[PDB]
Amino acid sequence: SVLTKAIVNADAEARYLSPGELDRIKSFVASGERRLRIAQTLTEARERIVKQAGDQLFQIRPDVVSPGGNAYGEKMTALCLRDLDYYLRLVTYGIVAGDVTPIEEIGIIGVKEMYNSLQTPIPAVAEGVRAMKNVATSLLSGDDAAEAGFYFDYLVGAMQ
Amino acid sequence: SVLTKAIVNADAEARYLSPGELDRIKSFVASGERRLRIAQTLTEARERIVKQAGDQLFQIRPDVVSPGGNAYGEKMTALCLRDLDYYLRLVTYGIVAGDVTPIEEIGIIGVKEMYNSLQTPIPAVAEGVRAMKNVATSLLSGDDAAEAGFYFDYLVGAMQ
Amino acid sequence: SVLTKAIVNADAEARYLSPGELDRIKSFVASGERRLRIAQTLTEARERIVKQAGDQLFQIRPDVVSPGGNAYGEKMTALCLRDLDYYLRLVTYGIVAGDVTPIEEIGIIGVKEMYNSLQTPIPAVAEGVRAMKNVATSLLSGDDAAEAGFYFDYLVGAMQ
Amino acid sequence: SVLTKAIVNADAEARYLSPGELDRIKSFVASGERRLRIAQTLTEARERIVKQAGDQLFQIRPDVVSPGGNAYGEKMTALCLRDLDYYLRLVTYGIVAGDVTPIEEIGIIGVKEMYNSLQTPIPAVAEGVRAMKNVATSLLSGDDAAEAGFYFDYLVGAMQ
Amino acid sequence: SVLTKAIVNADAEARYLSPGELDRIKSFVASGERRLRIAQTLTEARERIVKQAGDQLFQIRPDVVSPGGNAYGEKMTALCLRDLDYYLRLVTYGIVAGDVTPIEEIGIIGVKEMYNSLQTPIPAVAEGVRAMKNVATSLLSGDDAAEAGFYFDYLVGAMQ
Amino acid sequence: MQDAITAVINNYDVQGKYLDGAALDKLKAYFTTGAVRVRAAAVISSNATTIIKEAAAKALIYSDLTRPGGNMYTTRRYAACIRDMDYFLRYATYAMLAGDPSILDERVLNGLKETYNSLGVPIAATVGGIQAMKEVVGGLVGPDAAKEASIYFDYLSSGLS
Amino acid sequence: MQDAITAVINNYDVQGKYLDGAALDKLKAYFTTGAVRVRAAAVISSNATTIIKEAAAKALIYSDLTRPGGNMYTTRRYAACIRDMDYFLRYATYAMLAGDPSILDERVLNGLKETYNSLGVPIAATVGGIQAMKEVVGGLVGPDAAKEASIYFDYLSSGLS
Amino acid sequence: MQDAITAVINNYDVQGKYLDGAALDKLKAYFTTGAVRVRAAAVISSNATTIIKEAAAKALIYSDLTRPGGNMYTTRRYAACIRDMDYFLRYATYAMLAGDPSILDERVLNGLKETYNSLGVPIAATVGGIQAMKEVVGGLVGPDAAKEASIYFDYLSSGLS
Amino acid sequence: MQDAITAVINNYDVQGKYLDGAALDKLKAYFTTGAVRVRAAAVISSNATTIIKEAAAKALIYSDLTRPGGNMYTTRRYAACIRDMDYFLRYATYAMLAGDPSILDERVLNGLKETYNSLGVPIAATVGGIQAMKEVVGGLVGPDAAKEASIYFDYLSSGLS
Amino acid sequence: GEDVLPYERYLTPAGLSLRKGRFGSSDVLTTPGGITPRGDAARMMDKI
Amino acid sequence: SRYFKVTACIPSLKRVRTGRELQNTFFTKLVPYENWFTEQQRIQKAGGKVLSVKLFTGVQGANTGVGA
Ligand SMILES: *C[C@@H](*)[C@H]1/C(=C/c2[nH]c(/C=C3N=C(/C=C4\NC(=O)C(CC)=C4C)C(C)=C\3CCC(=O)O)c(CCC(=O)O)c2C)NC(=O)[C@@H]1C
Ligand SMILES: *C[C@@H](*)[C@H]1/C(=C/c2[nH]c(/C=C3N=C(/C=C4\NC(=O)C(CC)=C4C)C(C)=C\3CCC(=O)O)c(CCC(=O)O)c2C)NC(=O)[C@@H]1C
Ligand SMILES: *[C@H](C)[C@H]1/C(=C/c2[nH]c(/C=C3N=C(/C=C4\NC(=O)C(CC)=C4C)C(C)=C\3CCC(=O)O)c(CCC(=O)O)c2C)NC(=O)[C@@H]1C
Ligand SMILES: *[C@H](C)[C@H]1/C(=C/c2[nH]c(/C=C3N=C(/C=C4\NC(=O)C(CC)=C4C)C(C)=C\3CCC(=O)O)c(CCC(=O)O)c2C)NC(=O)[C@@H]1C
Ligand SMILES: *[C@H](C)[C@H]1/C(=C/c2[nH]c(/C=C3N=C(/C=C4\NC(=O)C(CC)=C4C)C(C)=C\3CCC(=O)O)c(CCC(=O)O)c2C)NC(=O)[C@@H]1C
Ligand SMILES: *[C@H](C)[C@H]1/C(=C/c2[nH]c(/C=C3N=C(/C=C4\NC(=O)C(CC)=C4C)C(C)=C\3CCC(=O)O)c(CCC(=O)O)c2C)NC(=O)[C@@H]1C
Ligand SMILES: *[C@H](C)[C@H]1/C(=C/c2[nH]c(/C=C3N=C(/C=C4\NC(=O)C(CC)=C4C)C(C)=C\3CCC(=O)O)c(CCC(=O)O)c2C)NC(=O)[C@@H]1C
């Protein structure tokens, strides 16, 4: 989170926190209830977001559910949806945290090697995340939709 | 400033701006007008703040204005109040910038060596900055006074 | 107190209290809680105020604690600080009463004669009282600070 | 000492003692008798030297023994004289060792931090050491006075 | 105290407190005001008790205040009276605590070793404590006199 | 260990001072609340097992702790957790009676954090159980000694966490 | 680096007077342009890969350079060129958010021509790719940020050529 | 390391759960005291050297520690002791800002006890100095953040001893 | 522990060599000074209590150490400190008799620094007391055994400090 | 003997610093004959 | 923030190193402003000479933008 970033940098340079860092902490604590409300809305709509995200991903890339597809089969598609739920939970974590350290330590570092191990299309996973971005922003006001969109776009950029 | 700090932090990691980093910039640009009002207020009240800070400093520390003091005579006392004016200008620059990068690059790095060479009491200069903060607190609103006092306390801690 | 002064005029003119006197009594009793808070605050900071006032007084003019000084020695400095404690108590009494009749009856009428008999510097005592005012106003909010400063300036003017 | 500074220097190259180093060790052992005699002469007159040096220091810098002075009071003055005695002891150690290695580790490294924490005037301490140098050179012949004063000037330069 | 021993033995047997120990606690808390009164009375009568006990001790055993005596001379009798004051303070502590635990920890364990090292007569100090007991019991009512005499006689017995 | 009275006695002993008005005020302040502490201790002692049962039912059991992989899984670990809960309750009662957390510092908290870290015991779950016991004890004892009992449960929870 | 606020601060610092009404107006203007700047940067960061894809498809692939005897030939060289393209996009976004091309000069534009001549990398094709990213961002972002985006995009091309 | 928010996130990630109501109250409870922590941290950072000086004057100097044969005899050892005090103050401020002692465990307590045992440093005197610093900091920051500052000083003292 | 004779014997045993002229010279070197050590030890044993009394009078008592707040305060701590002085004197006597500080290393200084730091004992005051005892013992024994007695007191003081 | 139960008799300093030692030592190390200004301000305040 | 672009040669005259002693004896490399002094002092201490130094990265004005 923002607190972890500021404290880590201050400790690394061996100094007290700067006024700019204190100001960013003040803004972060000010935006806390709004972030919590956005995360509550997303976690309440977690299943619908996942379902239409899967529908958009399957419409865009039917080859993945084709015989030579990584998610060919009902249980393979169930695993794809479970990864989708995992990434939605990570997005909610990042939204409440205010930055991307939890999302980074949980779901991007090594994700390239893991999905290479599983022979899964990383661009397909990114497209599914984009579908989630659309479905989630469809349930939120403009400012909060943009705030969630920042983390969704961060996930898409990280899976790259 | 905040923009240069966020950009340097992103560039070091060789990645795009994280959502919390964008939220920091958005908050700073939204809050810039209050900082501008603080800057214009301190600018138009620059001379009264310097005079009252000089009076408070000379009351607190008579040793600086004394037969053996660093500032004895007229030109010495003129130079001391001039240095107070420089630090007031740096405080205004920091307030408009939203961080302490210009203040650091202009007036604190090497100030220990400079004041040791000149044999000026660094705690005396810190007392002068504290008196400047006390004077400036009597010409601003409470939130605005706290916002200015953050950078004043940063200068006080940096001259330590 | 204001009640006493109103009753004294009413009895001198042989009449009941005027509506103006009743209104000033009402305002006088309305201000009681803030006055009691100020007196309580000064009473709790008795020792610190006295000690710091003594330190500032001796810094400003150390000749009184010199060998030829009036307050030379431990047992002589103790009496000077006790006099400062006396005047702080008189100031708290004046704040609670709302005006300076207790201060007049207890500590200023004849103070010139007593201090001339003891051969102590009344200008030194006045500066000692002023240092007590500064230390006291350092521990109060602005309105209460001005309210106490009125009585402190009364004492300073009276010892003149 | 000279022996430590010479042997360890010819140990960082994996060689025996240099034929250039089977010299000034030699002059050191030759002049060890004079060094011991000078150290004994300084040690016998430690109280008189300290007392006169403190007297000269308090005349030349009377602000330290004023109410706003670091060494104000009988026991704060006793501590100042104790520090002067400590530095005289370190000077005798340096004289016997023939090098300022022991005095450097014992009472110079970190002295700036210690005296800044205690809020003591380092220039005043340096002047006290200079007065001690004058009193010490007043009790010695010219060659021995120069030899002791050379270490005294080392202390004065290091406290700077 | 009584609470300490009750909790200590209950913990040692690894059990909640017995109703008998609760009855002890109830009686101890009930008698608290009376114990505080007795301790107060001895506290204000501490100096008269010490002086009269010293007179009685020096009359009963004049050899102690005599040239080969442990307490010969004004300073050695001052130290003896100081020890008597210490033991009276310990007795008041024991009276307030409810049992002689503080007396044991502060002035009985190792008293034989310390006084043998100092070469002081244990029977003489016991006689002094008994004289203190008599003088103290002459200033109290009967029940309070018995209550204080219990601790005084414990001290006399332990110094043996 | 030390109670309020012995604490005041030692505090004045280290200064070598007779008991004065302030020390007498502190002692009177303790003596005034003597009976309430005894009544609360009797109530807690009589309701000891029931308090542990409700605290466990509210904070520990019916979760992943009591299932396979949980730390409190298996009968030995369940008995261990309930015995630890009993120890915490008993020493909280002792500290409340003595009016001083010194016994908690000396006989419970010493090395407890490191012991739990070595054994793998979840300190967060232990703190949750302690707070559940605190809620139940506050319910039982009533307003009179509720805050007095609760401060020592908070002391134990803060010492662990 | 030097953003707009830091640039104004330096401009007044080298001359040694306080902030003026002109400085207030400039800072107010940059504050007004803040929100759309952040939105455009977010959109570009979201669609970074797509921009490179269209720019390559428009000016880079299917040509002589994407065949044998080309600087783009071999996967390593093509990856190096696309990484340079991502560098241009990222530093253009940084300069767009900052308001000043100091980052574009020192971190990007500084050098970048002697190295290209030494390596043998074509420069006209690189400038064409930079302009290709220019029209791609022109469609991806709204017209509010189009002009300021285009000026920093043209800055890299002008420095390279 | 971890703050309160990240601690809650890891505590739910280990169970694979979305944030629930209780996690929401925990996050809200931290967010409610954000400003007080920042204000007290600024106060401590501004008064760092004075706090150390007063704590040393109250608890360390004028002792055996400053006399020959003591542990903080000689200027080098005095500077080292004050440096250690500054270390403790800075990390206490970091822990107070983060609302979690994880940074204290990771960056201070691990192995410091064994290092002090090897060097012969008096751990009891060090903890006394930390407590004096705690008293001074509680005086400076005021009732608002006095307890919240004091918990981490108590944590450091308990971990060291 | 070990003495001069056993030290020579073990030093030749670990290298498996027979008693040569060099070890013989060390052996008669110890044998020549046997009577002086025995006389000094007898004098010290006869005057044990007076030495401790005078050392305590010169270095410890009549100060803030024996006042409230001092470590020597209370009968318990006074008896413990004079017991420690007796410890140091007795082990110095054993070391002087054996002509080897190995007994001091094995049974006196091991862990003593950490034990004193844990208990709160003033190590500087202890070293001062040991020096006073050394001065008194050197006065009593005379030049014949003054240096031999003083070297082991100096070893104890250097180990402690 | 034959009646007394075994009980804890000795502690190592590491263990002893665990039971006590929390909140450190409040005594302050005193020295014999040291120069200290502690308590002088309090005495002056009481004298006043 | 700025890096000096310099070229220099440094001969080793005490040890006669015996494997590929050519890349470490004549080099051009960007060195930061904060580390340039310590980098350049080493060449003078060893005995080599600096052939040229260039600003490259930063502007001559300094003031803001110096820090990094
Ligand atoms: C000429 C006297 C100047 C002066 C001195 C001053 N010193 C102190 C306090 C201390 N000084 C020391 C010094 C040393 N410790 C070491 O190990 C060495 C190396 C041998 C030195 C020099 C220390 C440790 C202290 C702290 C107290 C203590 O010794 O226990 C003070 C007291 C300051 C206070 O606030 O109490 C003074 C005044 N002051 C002057 O004005 C002179 C220039
Ligand atoms: C109030 C000062 C007390 C004191 C301290 C003391 N410390 C040392 C030496 C060291 N201190 C440290 C400390 C740390 N390492 C870490 O990782 C951290 C936290 C991140 C800390 C606090 C270390 C590593 C050392 C050893 C290296 C060194 O010697 O500098 C010393 C010096 C001991 C010596 O001379 O050998 C002292 C005196 N001493 C006291 O008496 C105070 C209670
Ligand atoms: C007095 C009635 C008898 C007596 C006493 C006597 N005492 C001393 C010296 C000391 N006494 C103490 C005592 C204590 N220290 C503690 O901690 C406690 C427990 C509270 C006690 C009682 C101490 C420490 C000393 C040593 C000096 C000091 O205090 O610093 C003397 C002086 C002996 C000397 O050799 O100087 C005397 C005479 N003597 C009598 O004859 C009485 C019977
Ligand atoms: C119960 C709510 C939680 C829990 C606990 C748990 N503890 C152990 C084992 C031990 N607990 C202790 C405790 C103490 N020693 C003391 O001195 C004190 C204070 C006086 C305490 C509280 C110790 C020493 C042990 C180890 C020895 C032993 O097992 O008896 C276990 C058993 C672990 C194992 O099987 O090895 C458990 C389960 N577990 C939970 O899930 C709760 C959060
Ligand atoms: C065929 C089995 C798979 C497949 C391939 C595919 N490739 C392209 C386009 C290009 N492929 C290359 C390849 C290389 N460049 C190199 O330097 C090397 C190393 C020798 C290789 C292999 C390039 C450069 C292009 C771009 C066009 C060009 O060469 O100029 C496409 C077309 C993509 C498009 O968007 O039109 C395709 C489809 N497709 C499959 O389904 C197979 C898995
Ligand atoms: C891309 C549009 C064109 C192209 C490029 C190309 N570049 C390289 C190699 C390098 N490019 C860089 C660039 C930078 N280094 C920096 O630090 C920065 C700014 C931060 C830049 C812009 C450098 C230094 C190299 C060399 C090291 C490396 O390869 O990473 C190559 C590879 C050349 C080779 O094989 O040696 C290529 C192909 N080529 C085209 O055809 C495009 C038009
Ligand atoms: C020998 C036939 C002639 C000669 C030579 C000479 N050379 C040096 C110093 C250096 N020689 C090298 C060589 C290399 N560096 C490499 O990387 C390679 C290939 C991998 C080579 C061949 C370099 C770089 C140096 C300088 C650094 C160093 O000294 O190692 C010297 C010493 C010069 C001096 O004293 O500074 C000499 C004398 N001298 C003759 O007379 C022959 C004609």
PDB file of N, CA, C and O and ligand atoms in Angstrom, chain G residues 53 60-63 65-67 72-76 78, ligand 5:
ATOM      1  N   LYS G  53       1.037  -2.340 -31.693  1.00  0.00           N
ATOM      2  CA  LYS G  53       0.583  -3.274 -32.720  1.00  0.00           C
ATOM      3  C   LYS G  53       0.128  -2.540 -33.979  1.00  0.00           C
ATOM      4  O   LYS G  53       0.542  -2.881 -35.094  1.00  0.00           O
ATOM      5  N   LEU G  60       5.741  -0.681 -40.194  1.00  0.00           N
ATOM      6  CA  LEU G  60       6.917  -1.481 -39.886  1.00  0.00           C
ATOM      7  C   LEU G  60       6.874  -2.863 -40.530  1.00  0.00           C
ATOM      8  O   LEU G  60       7.818  -3.253 -41.224  1.00  0.00           O
ATOM      9  N   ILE G  61       5.787  -3.614 -40.316  1.00  0.00           N
ATOM     10  CA  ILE G  61       5.754  -4.991 -40.807  1.00  0.00           C
ATOM     11  C   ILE G  61       5.257  -5.028 -42.250  1.00  0.00           C
ATOM     12  O   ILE G  61       4.701  -4.058 -42.779  1.00  0.00           O
ATOM     13  N   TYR G  62       5.496  -6.173 -42.900  1.00  0.00           N
ATOM     14  CA  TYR G  62       5.116  -6.457 -44.283  1.00  0.00           C
ATOM     15  C   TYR G  62       5.924  -5.657 -45.302  1.00  0.00           C
ATOM     16  O   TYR G  62       5.651  -5.729 -46.505  1.00  0.00           O
ATOM     17  N   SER G  63       6.919  -4.907 -44.844  1.00  0.00           N
ATOM     18  CA  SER G  63       7.750  -4.084 -45.704  1.00  0.00           C
ATOM     19  C   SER G  63       9.103  -4.761 -45.913  1.00  0.00           C
ATOM     20  O   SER G  63       9.315  -5.913 -45.523  1.00  0.00           O
ATOM     21  N   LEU G  65      11.819  -3.923 -44.436  1.00  0.00           N
ATOM     22  CA  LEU G  65      12.513  -4.019 -43.157  1.00  0.00           C
ATOM     23  C   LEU G  65      12.148  -5.294 -42.408  1.00  0.00           C
ATOM     24  O   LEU G  65      12.949  -5.795 -41.611  1.00  0.00           O
ATOM     25  N   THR G  66      10.953  -5.834 -42.649  1.00  0.00           N
ATOM     26  CA  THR G  66      10.500  -7.060 -42.002  1.00  0.00           C
ATOM     27  C   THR G  66      10.843  -8.304 -42.816  1.00  0.00           C
ATOM     28  O   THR G  66      10.166  -9.335 -42.698  1.00  0.00           O
ATOM     29  N   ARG G  67      11.876  -8.231 -43.640  1.00  0.00           N
ATOM     30  CA  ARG G  67      12.334  -9.318 -44.488  1.00  0.00           C
ATOM     31  C   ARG G  67      13.829  -9.504 -44.290  1.00  0.00           C
ATOM     32  O   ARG G  67      14.465  -8.726 -43.569  1.00  0.00           O
ATOM     33  N   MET G  72      15.241  -4.846 -38.902  1.00  0.00           N
ATOM     34  CA  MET G  72      14.143  -5.470 -38.173  1.00  0.00           C
ATOM     35  C   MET G  72      14.175  -6.989 -38.252  1.00  0.00           C
ATOM     36  O   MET G  72      13.436  -7.663 -37.534  1.00  0.00           O
ATOM     37  N   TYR G  73      15.019  -7.526 -39.130  1.00  0.00           N
ATOM     38  CA  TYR G  73      15.091  -8.971 -39.287  1.00  0.00           C
ATOM     39  C   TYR G  73      15.644  -9.590 -38.008  1.00  0.00           C
ATOM     40  O   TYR G  73      16.384  -8.948 -37.259  1.00  0.00           O
ATOM     41  N   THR G  74      15.237 -10.836 -37.748  1.00  0.00           N
ATOM     42  CA  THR G  74      15.546 -11.608 -36.545  1.00  0.00           C
ATOM     43  C   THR G  74      14.717 -11.132 -35.356  1.00  0.00           C
ATOM     44  O   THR G  74      14.513  -9.924 -35.152  1.00  0.00           O
ATOM     45  N   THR G  75      14.234 -12.107 -34.581  1.00  0.00           N
ATOM     46  CA  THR G  75      13.315 -11.833 -33.482  1.00  0.00           C
ATOM     47  C   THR G  75      13.957 -10.940 -32.432  1.00  0.00           C
ATOM     48  O   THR G  75      13.283 -10.116 -31.810  1.00  0.00           O
ATOM     49  N   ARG G  76      15.267 -11.087 -32.223  1.00  0.00           N
ATOM     50  CA  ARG G  76      15.954 -10.268 -31.231  1.00  0.00           C
ATOM     51  C   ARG G  76      15.944  -8.798 -31.627  1.00  0.00           C
ATOM     52  O   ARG G  76      15.645  -7.922 -30.808  1.00  0.00           O
ATOM     53  N   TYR G  78      13.833  -7.366 -33.746  1.00  0.00           N
ATOM     54  CA  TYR G  78      12.458  -6.871 -33.723  1.00  0.00           C
ATOM     55  C   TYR G  78      12.002  -6.593 -32.293  1.00  0.00           C
ATOM     56  O   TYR G  78      11.294  -5.613 -32.032  1.00  0.00           O
TER      57      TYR G  78
HETATM   58  C1  LIG L   5       2.409 -20.532 -38.266  1.00  0.00           C
HETATM   59  C2  LIG L   5       2.811 -21.950 -37.921  1.00  0.00           C
HETATM   60  C3  LIG L   5       1.825 -19.772 -37.075  1.00  0.00           C
HETATM   61  C4  LIG L   5       1.361 -18.377 -37.407  1.00  0.00           C
HETATM   62  C5  LIG L   5       2.201 -17.344 -37.836  1.00  0.00           C
HETATM   63  C6  LIG L   5       2.088 -15.988 -38.312  1.00  0.00           C
HETATM   64  N1  LIG L   5       3.177 -15.171 -38.484  1.00  0.00           N
HETATM   65  C7  LIG L   5       2.793 -13.943 -38.957  1.00  0.00           C
HETATM   66  C8  LIG L   5       3.635 -12.867 -39.222  1.00  0.00           C
HETATM   67  C9  LIG L   5       5.012 -12.762 -39.078  1.00  0.00           C
HETATM   68  N2  LIG L   5       5.836 -13.771 -38.667  1.00  0.00           N
HETATM   69  C10 LIG L   5       7.103 -13.257 -38.649  1.00  0.00           C
HETATM   70  C11 LIG L   5       8.213 -14.009 -38.304  1.00  0.00           C
HETATM   71  C12 LIG L   5       9.566 -13.927 -38.148  1.00  0.00           C
HETATM   72  N3  LIG L   5      10.413 -12.827 -38.282  1.00  0.00           N
HETATM   73  C13 LIG L   5      11.711 -13.228 -38.042  1.00  0.00           C
HETATM   74  O1  LIG L   5      12.682 -12.513 -38.077  1.00  0.00           O
HETATM   75  C14 LIG L   5      11.648 -14.697 -37.749  1.00  0.00           C
HETATM   76  C15 LIG L   5      12.856 -15.524 -37.454  1.00  0.00           C
HETATM   77  C16 LIG L   5      13.467 -16.119 -38.715  1.00  0.00           C
HETATM   78  C17 LIG L   5      10.342 -15.063 -37.811  1.00  0.00           C
HETATM   79  C18 LIG L   5       9.855 -16.460 -37.568  1.00  0.00           C
HETATM   80  C19 LIG L   5       7.067 -11.850 -39.043  1.00  0.00           C
HETATM   81  C20 LIG L   5       8.215 -10.888 -39.145  1.00  0.00           C
HETATM   82  C21 LIG L   5       5.771 -11.546 -39.317  1.00  0.00           C
HETATM   83  C22 LIG L   5       5.193 -10.234 -39.761  1.00  0.00           C
HETATM   84  C23 LIG L   5       5.037 -10.091 -41.279  1.00  0.00           C
HETATM   85  C24 LIG L   5       6.348 -10.029 -42.044  1.00  0.00           C
HETATM   86  O2  LIG L   5       7.102 -11.021 -42.009  1.00  0.00           O
HETATM   87  O3  LIG L   5       6.611  -8.987 -42.676  1.00  0.00           O
HETATM   88  C25 LIG L   5       1.378 -13.987 -39.119  1.00  0.00           C
HETATM   89  C26 LIG L   5       0.533 -12.856 -39.630  1.00  0.00           C
HETATM   90  C27 LIG L   5      -0.022 -11.968 -38.523  1.00  0.00           C
HETATM   91  C28 LIG L   5      -0.907 -10.839 -39.025  1.00  0.00           C
HETATM   92  O4  LIG L   5      -1.419 -10.073 -38.185  1.00  0.00           O
HETATM   93  O5  LIG L   5      -1.084 -10.732 -40.254  1.00  0.00           O
HETATM   94  C29 LIG L   5       0.942 -15.232 -38.736  1.00  0.00           C
HETATM   95  C30 LIG L   5      -0.475 -15.706 -38.757  1.00  0.00           C
HETATM   96  N4  LIG L   5      -0.015 -18.328 -37.237  1.00  0.00           N
HETATM   97  C31 LIG L   5      -0.533 -19.487 -36.727  1.00  0.00           C
HETATM   98  O6  LIG L   5      -1.711 -19.696 -36.508  1.00  0.00           O
HETATM   99  C32 LIG L   5       0.594 -20.452 -36.456  1.00  0.00           C
HETATM  100  C33 LIG L   5       0.728 -20.831 -34.990  1.00  0.00           C
END
